[PDB]
C-alpha cells in the first residue's frame, strides 16, 4: 500500500513512533517519504547482496532475512518480506530498534541528507493527530 502523507503520520502514532527516542514524528514522515515515497512494497538493491525494503527501507544485512544476502545476521529477527506487507507494525517495531543502537536517524541516508534540519513538522500539518 502506498500511505498518505497525513494518514501515515496517524498510524505511525498509533505506534509509538512520535518522539521515539526524540525523534518527532515529522522526522518519520519525512523519512518514509524521501526513502519510500508512502509506499511499503519499495525494494531496491545497493551493490552488496544487500536489497532495501517497505516503508522505511530496513536494510538486510542487519535488520531482517531476505534468503539471499549472505552477510546477513537477522537483528530484526522477521524476514524481510514481511516489512512489505500495508501493515508497518513489523517495520516500524524493527526500526525502533535501528534507531536505538546508537546513530539515531543517520543510520537513514535520506532523513540526514533531506530531512535533518528542515521545519518536519510542516509533514504533519494539517493533521488530526
Known amino acids: 500500500k502506498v ?3 497525513c494518514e501515515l503520520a496517524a498510524a505511525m502514532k498509533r505506534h509509538g513512533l512520535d518522539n521515539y527516542r526524540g525523534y518527532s514524528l515529522g522526522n518519520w514522515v519525512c523519512a ?5 515515497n508512502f509506499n511499503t512494497q ?15 527501507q530496513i536494510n538486510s544485512r542487519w535488520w531482517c532475512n ?7 545476521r537477522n537483528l530484526c529477527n522477521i524476514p524481510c518480506s514481511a516489512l512489505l506487507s500495508s501493515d508497518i507494525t513489523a517495520s516500524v517495531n524493527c526500526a525502533k530498534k535501528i534507531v536505538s543502537d546508537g546513530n ?9 541528507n533531506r530531512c535533518k534540519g528542515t521545519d518536519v513538522q510542516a509533514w504533519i500539518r494539517g ?3
Open 42 to 56: 519499495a525494494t531496491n538493491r545497493n551493490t552488496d547482496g544487500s536489497t532495501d525494503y517497505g516503508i522505511l
Open 127 to 129: 493533521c488530526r493527530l
Open 104 to 112: 539515531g536517524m543517520n543510520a537513514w541516508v535520506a532523513w540526514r
Open 66 to 72: 531476505d534468503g539471499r544476502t549472505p552477510g546477513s
Open 3 to 5: 500511505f498518505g502523507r
Open 32 to 36: 518514509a517519504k524521501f526513502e519510500s
